[PDB]
Design a protein around this ligand. Sequence first.
Ligand SMILES: CCCC(CCC)C(=O)N[C@@H]1Cc2ccc(S(N)(=O)=O)cc2C1
Ligand SMILES: [Zn+2]
Length: 259
Amino acid sequence: SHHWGYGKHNGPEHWHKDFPIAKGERQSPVDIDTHTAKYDPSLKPLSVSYDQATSLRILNNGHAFNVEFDDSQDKAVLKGGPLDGTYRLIQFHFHWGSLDGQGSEHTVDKKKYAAELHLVHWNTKYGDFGKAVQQPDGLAVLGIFLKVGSAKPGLQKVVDVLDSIKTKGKSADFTNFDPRGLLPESLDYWTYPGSLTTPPLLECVTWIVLKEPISVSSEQVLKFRKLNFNGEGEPEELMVDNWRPAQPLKNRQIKASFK
Ligand SMILES: CCCC(CCC)C(=O)N[C@@H]1Cc2ccc(S(N)(=O)=O)cc2C1
Ligand SMILES: [Zn+2]
């Protein structure tokens, strides 16, 4: 009944009770101190190959909405950078705020963006997602910040279908969506070992956070804010501020792909 969420009695500060790893040694998100981050020459060129990506459905899971992809074959993959091997795209989703001044999970020199896009990939050496989340290098999440300004044309198809998945549990066919339309020009990034930012908070993620944010219009993000945390027929609880705040960096160093 009393499941985790982002409210006063079931939010981020409560998660550790059911998920003790919430106070772990490599939790995410974290604040990215740009001056302390160090350029790493050992990093190989990052490769984002989404040309063959095949989306299948979009779902409101009561915490955010997921655009799911068919990962039964080697198509949309992420490799290079800090990664060893190939990681396959399985889904992407966002975290956003109730206001333009907040919403992102990672922060840059304490600056919060309006939202943050997470493209989730699993290490193919482990067979599938389930086995991957039992490994310290099982996942790679490409994070992209969203700022409010000009509209992002490639995001509109997502925005327009949200009306069909307003409440928790609802899903809708969502084929032929090209995630390449959500990527900024530059692939400059920061990377560090972390975790899932929502329960179960598993520490199996290599985070790759792009420095360049994408711009989305006020109208686009306002539609994100029309979604509901609640299910159909229940009192309306707007899906906003579904972000976890920065966690202790502890024994970690953030590396930059650029000088
Ligand atoms: C450990 C796997 C359990 C299942 C449960 C949902 C049916 C699951 O898919 N959880 C999802 C998987 C996933 C992937 C990335 C992130 S994030 N925010 O760090 O980018 C959060 C979560 C929670
Ligand atoms: Zn996320």
